[PDB]
Amino acid sequence: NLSYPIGEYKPRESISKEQKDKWIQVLEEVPAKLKQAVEVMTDSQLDTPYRDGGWTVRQVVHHLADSHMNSYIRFKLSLTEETPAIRPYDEKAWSELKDSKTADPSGSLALLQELHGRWTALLRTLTDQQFKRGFYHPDTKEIITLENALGLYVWHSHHHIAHITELSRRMGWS
Amino acid sequence: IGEYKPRESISKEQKDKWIQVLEEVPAKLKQAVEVMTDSQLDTPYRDGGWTVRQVVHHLADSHMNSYIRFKLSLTEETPAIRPYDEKAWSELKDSKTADPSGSLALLQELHGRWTALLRTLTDQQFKRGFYHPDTKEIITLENALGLYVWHSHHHIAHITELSRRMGWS
Amino acid sequence: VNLSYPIGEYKPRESISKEQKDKWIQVLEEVPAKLKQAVEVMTDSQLDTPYRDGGWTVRQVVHHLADSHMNSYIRFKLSLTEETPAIRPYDEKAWSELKDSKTADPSGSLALLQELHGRWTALLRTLTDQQFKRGFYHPDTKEIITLENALGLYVWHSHHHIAHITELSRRMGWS
Amino acid sequence: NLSYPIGEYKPRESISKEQKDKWIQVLEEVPAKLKQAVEVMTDSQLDTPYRDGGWTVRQVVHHLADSHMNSYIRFKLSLTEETPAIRPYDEKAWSELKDSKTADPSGSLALLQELHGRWTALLRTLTDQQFKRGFYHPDTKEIITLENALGLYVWHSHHHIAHITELSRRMGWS
Ligand code: NI
Ligand code: NI
Ligand code: NI
Ligand code: NI
């Protein structure tokens, strides 16, 4: 399970207030946890693939920032339009841009901290009804509610963090 | 002060000036709003218009969308971008009440990554474009850079003009 | 790059958390048992095998850890009782070439490391956050390092030289 | 007297092989003698000053560990550098650290046992010429040879052990 260290996100129809509130807290804490994992690494460690054939740690960090900026936008689209079709992006192509392969993680780590700050602030304003609003992914044709999207991105965060910490543990880094 | 004028060609020198201006935008916005009380933040810059607070959150939202559009344009062949309802976004409770500090900090880091991206681009990458399905126009990335410099200055001016007229300090 | 630096190098940080410090104190306390694990099973011929071509023997690495870490413990106490003291460099290559370093049984050094790490971690657990931010100065490299980063550095140093030994056993197919 | 129960160390110009060998044996035995001096002691006994203005028995134990670690390092500097300047430390300040005032003697007694084992091992490897190598205090600018340093640390050992045994005798303890 190199590609999926903590499995995949399982959607449900029934998500409690306590569960939503906990996921919001977990989401706010993601950037610190990511920073803890990555700040110990030198450039050659950052440029080490997390698995054979896969992205480097540096790429994963920049991907989290790009993915989560897209997600935040999708939340605001969903709150302001009725089940909007969202705009997919080619995450593989984004990760192959020169910047994604060479930029220091610090800027993306700082962006993520502030982004998850604003995102969790938005989430704390939402009513139960607003959490039941959704959006449509054009490629996969599936509709996801905002409460499930919150669960999904808690998963996505920790999925990628686990790629990094697993690599770090396997290589004997800190 | 004036609407942006699209150009067929933009010099390397002008691009570099605009990247630097874009890098400085968040510090200029912070200087314009950081001493403001809630009363001042929730004052409309004009009669039927958005408050200073709504403008700050809008810049963060607008510019995040723009950064995404840049990356779509660099990875797809003349992509159609995804418009958003900017008025509806500004009417969300969070837009009307959140403290500016978070959006100011986000804008700082966002412009940091955006200008980093811009400094990696070749001249030919700056000639890549995207299609805005509302205006029907193919906009090149070098012109979009110009547009977002104007966007920044236009909104910051609205804020500083309000403070000047009201005698705030 | 890999034979010499099997787990990379230590990267200092501007800030170290209470939780990280506590973990590192625990790891440092247990380091000697891990070293002993690796060296306990080895014959004299194995002890006198270089960890890489042109490198120290396993025996020398063990005695080096004891010498290095004694030096470090002293540097911590200097740092706590003086204001950013300049510490005393030592010639690690020359220390490892002493007859004693090339021939002494590892047992004494292993036992010394166990007790030293015991006293060192006891010291560390008494320290306030402010004391952990105190630093010392290396007169040759011109570097200033804080005690919390020196802690991270010596956890690394332990793992680094243990890896020298375990990587050797693996490459050699020993048991 | 009370401060100097066995007087002070008097350096000599030369030291016989016989004296050097006797001193190496004494040094090997010091940790056991120290252990015996504090063997039964309660915490209140350990926290008794050895004389009115003085360190507690506990502080004396931890001081011996610290002093002798510093001395061992000074031997190795002397063997590997040409008459090195050594690095003084503030004995009083080290002894005032919370750890020095409170830690159980056990760990320092065990450290001393292992340290003296490595130290006497080193000493048994030395040639006569290596024993004539020295080091200087940057302040006293006195050169001390390793054979005299051996005599000095034999003295130091029994000086501080006497502080303890004399205390026990003066009090009712032993
Ligand atoms: Ni992903
Ligand atoms: Ni605008
Ligand atoms: Ni080393
Ligand atoms: Ni003394």
* 3-state helix/strand/coil string of B118-142: HHHCCHHHHCCEEEECCCCEEEEHH
Give, as one character, the DSSP assignment of residue A83: S
**CATH no., domain D1-174:** 1.20.120.450
C26-32, long-range: CB < 8 A, 24+ apart:
C27/C155, C27/C158, C28/C117, C28/C120, C28/C121, C28/C124, C28/C151, C28/C154, C28/C155, C28/C158, C29/C117, C29/C118, C29/C121, C31/C113, C31/C117, C31/C155, C31/C158, C31/C159, C31/C162, C32/C110, C32/C113, C32/C114, C32/C117
Amino acid type, D130: Q
Say which CATH architecture domain B1-169 belongs to. Answer: Up-down Bundle (1.20)
Q: How deeply is A140 buried, as exposed, middle or buried, from its count of CB atoms within 10 A (0-12, 13-18, 19+)?
A: exposed
Across the interface, which of C11, C155, C163 has its CB nearest the CB of A42? Answer: C11
Residue with tokens 């804020």: B159
Q: Which ligand is nearest to the CA of A61?
A: 1
Question: What span, in angstroms and rounded, lies between the C-alpha atoms of A36 and C16?
Answer: 10
For chain C, which residues make up each domain, given as ranges?
1-175
> Closest Cα partner for B60 from B102, B93, B22?
B102
* Distance (Å) of CA D75 to CA C18, C77, D128, D146: 37, 20, 14, 7
* Distance (Å) of CA A67 to CA A71, A95, A153, C59, C95: 6, 11, 9, 51, 53
Question: What span, in angstroms and rounded, lies between the C-alpha atoms of D27 and D21?
Answer: 10
> Closest Cα partner for A30 from A141, A152, A125?
A152
Question: What span, in angstroms and rounded, lies between the C-alpha atoms of C136 and A171?
Answer: 30
Solved using: X-ray
Across the interface, which of B71, B88, B120 has its CB nearest the CB of A66? Answer: B71
Instruction: Calculate how far, in angstroms, residue B65's C-alpha sits from the geometric centre of ligand 2.
Output: 12
Size of interface A-B (CB pairs under 8 A): 88
Q: Which residues of B fall below an 8 Å CB-CB distance to A? A: 60-61, 64-65, 67-68, 71-72, 74-76, 81-82, 84-85, 88-89, 92-94, 97-98, 102-103, 105-106, 108-110, 112-113, 116-117, 120
Instruction: Calculate how far, in angstroms, residue A158's C-alpha sits from the geometric centre of ligand 1.
Output: 10
Instruction: Calculate how far, in angstroms, residue D99's C-alpha sits from the geometric centre of ligand 4.
Output: 17
Q: Which residues of D fall below an 8 Å CB-CB distance to C? A: 65-66, 69-70, 72-73, 76-77, 79-81, 86-87, 89-90, 93-94, 97-99, 102-103, 107-108, 110-111, 113-115, 117-118, 121-122, 125
Subunits close to C (at least 3 CB pairs below 8 A): A, D
Question: What span, in angstroms and rounded, lies between the C-alpha atoms of D152 and B150?
Answer: 80
Q: Which residues of C fall below an 8 Å CB-CB distance to A? A: 6-11, 13, 17, 20, 152, 155-156, 159, 163
**How far out from the chain centre does Cα B169 lie?**
24
Q: Which residues of A touch C4 (CB under 8 A)?
A: none
Helix (H) or strand (E) holding D135: strand D134-136
Q: Which residues of C touch D117 (CB under 8 A)?
A: 108, 111-112
Q: Which ligand is nearest to the CA of A65?
A: 1
Are D147 and D100 a contacting pair, CB within 8 Å?
Answer: no
The token duo for B155 is: 């909104």
Amino acid type, C144: I
Question: What span, in angstroms and rounded, lies between the C-alpha atoms of A86 and A138?
Answer: 7
Residue with tokens 């997919």: A88
Q: Which ligand is nearest to the CA of B153?
A: 2
Which of C11, C28, C162 would you mutate first to test chain A, the one with the most A CBs within 10 A?
C11
Question: What span, in angstroms and rounded, lies between the C-alpha atoms of C87 and C76?
Answer: 10
One DSSP character per residue, chain C reads: --SS-TT------S---HHHHHHHHHHHHHHHHHHHHHHTT--HHHHTSBSSTTSPBHHHHHHHHHHHHHHHHHHHHHHHHSSS-B-----HHHHHHSHHHHHS-HHHHHHHHHHHHHHHHHHHHH--HHHHT-EEE-TTT--EEEHHHHHHHHHHHHHHHHHHHHHHHHHHT--
Name the 3-class secondary structure at B44.
strand
Q: Which residues of A touch C10 (CB under 8 A)?
A: 174
Q: How deeply is A160 buried, as exposed, middle or buried, from its count of CB atoms within 10 A (0-12, 13-18, 19+)?
A: buried
Do the chains B and C touch each other, judged by at least 3 C-beta pairs below 8 angstroms?
A: no
Resolution in A: 1.7
CA distance D92 to chain C (A): 9
The token duo for C22 is: 């506590």
A117 and B106: CB-CB below 8 Å?
Answer: yes
Question: What span, in angstroms and rounded, lies between the C-alpha atoms of C69 and B41?
Answer: 58
The class that CATH gives domain C1-175 is: mainly alpha
Q: How deeply is D136 buried, as exposed, middle or buried, from its count of CB atoms within 10 A (0-12, 13-18, 19+)?
A: middle
Which of D73, D106, D116 would you mutate first to test chain C, the one with the most C CBs within 10 A?
D73
Helix (H) or strand (E) holding A136: strand A134-136
**Within chain C, what is the greatest distance between any pair of CA atoms?**
49
